Amino acid sequence: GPVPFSHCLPTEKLQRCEKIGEGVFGEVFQTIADHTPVAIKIIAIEGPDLVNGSHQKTFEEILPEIIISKELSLLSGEVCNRTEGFIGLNSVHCVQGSYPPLLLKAWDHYNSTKGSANDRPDFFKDDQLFIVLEFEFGGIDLEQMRTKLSSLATAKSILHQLTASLAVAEASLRFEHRDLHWGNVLLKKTSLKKLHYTLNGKSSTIPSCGLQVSIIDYTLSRLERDGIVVFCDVSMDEDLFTGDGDYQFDIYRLMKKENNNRWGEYHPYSNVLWLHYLTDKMLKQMTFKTKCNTPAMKQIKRKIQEFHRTMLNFSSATDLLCQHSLFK
Ligand SMILES: CC[C@H](CO)Nc1ccc2ncc(-c3ccc4n[nH]cc4c3)n2n1
Ligand code: NA
């Protein structure tokens, strides 16, 4: 059945853990496994204590995220519909134990420097179960990089990458991400000048501007294979739809409007909505190292503004990728 935490996180691996993110689900750490950076997502399951304001999920309720993470990871190795724009999934374990004190130390450091919205995970007993997902390390989130991007050309690249990856997942998996806020877009440096994707057998390239994008966090995502749908049913969630103070919170309500609160259905317009929210962040909340004070860069800005203005008239990421003038 379950294994002890030390199976997944031997002493040296625990000693190198640094906390990088969080959500109601639990905690995300970066560490090193076999000289390789990885990200570890740790989710409490099956217990009766409140955790970050929700009850813990059952093993059955975590399976959708596991399945989705695996399907999107596989897309990097496929042929007809191929993208590296999600993130690799290396392993999944069920572990048992109280939270390691070294992880608490990392948690404390994050709380001291960035602040946490979570409860300190120090109340779990030695019989507590967790799911531990180990992912390829994907870089730094777009929000944390909001003052670090070179120019609007870099912004165009990121939007193109995101759109393409979403299109390929729509094509292969009838995928909707459903929570693609700017914390869920990771950026990593690449020396590749061009990145490659294949959509329904047709391969294309995207200029990288030195960055490779990875879309993460499939907690709210939906997909299907052979008529079998995997999703998070939020039809009875109150709080998800009553956020304020950021366009992000409007996106939840707009998705609910689009799907009539039926979350099992396929509505790839949700991917469009998130891309619109991301484009909006690109135009309003980023500080580029190079301003748009040359005619060439101005032109890119006008193109992104045109995208912002027109993209909500498209039906899916696939429609955007294949038809929108931004990508031509
Ligand atoms: C970078 C940390 C991020 C900042 O907004 N927060 C979260 C929060 C939820 C979440 N679920 C999965 C991942 C996840 C999955 C794979 C990863 N590879 N490299 C980093 C990864 C993170 N996250 N990350
Ligand atoms: Na990736």
Author numbering: 471 to 798
What does the primary publication say about this deposited structure?
Haspin is a mitotic protein kinase required for proper cell division by modulating Aurora B kinase localisation and activity as well as histone phosphorylation. Haspin phosphorylates Histone H3 on threonine 3 (H3T3ph) at mitosis leading to the recruitment and clustering of Aurora B to the centromere. Haspin kinase appears essential for mitosis as its depletion or inhibition results in cell death caused by mitotic catastrophe. Haspin has atypical structural features that are unique to this kinase, increasing the likelihood of identifying specific inhibitors that may result in fewer off-target effects.
To guide the design of new inhibitors, we solved a high-resolution crystal structure of an early derivative with Haspin. We next determined the co-crystal structure of Haspin in complex with derivative 12 to determine the binding mode of the inhibitor within the kinase. The inhibitor adopted a planar conformation, positioning the indazole moiety for hydrogen bonds to the hinge region. This orientation resulted in the imidazopyridazine group protruding further in the pocket, interacting with the catalytic lysine Lys511. The amino alkyl side chain decoration tucked beneath the β1 and β242, and occupied the space towards the solvent exposed region of the pocket. This binding mode of compound 12 demonstrated shape complementarity to the ATP-binding pocket of the kinase, thus explaining the good potency of the inhibitor. Our data clearly show the competition between compound 12 and ATP, as the calculated IC50 increased from 6 nM at 5 µM ATP to 950 nM at 240 µM ATP. However, two compounds (5 and 12) showed strong inhibition of CDK1 (IC50 of 29 and 52 nM, respectively), which could account for the accumulation of cells in G2/M phase. All the compounds tested achieved in-cell Haspin inhibition, with compounds 12 and 21 being the most effective.
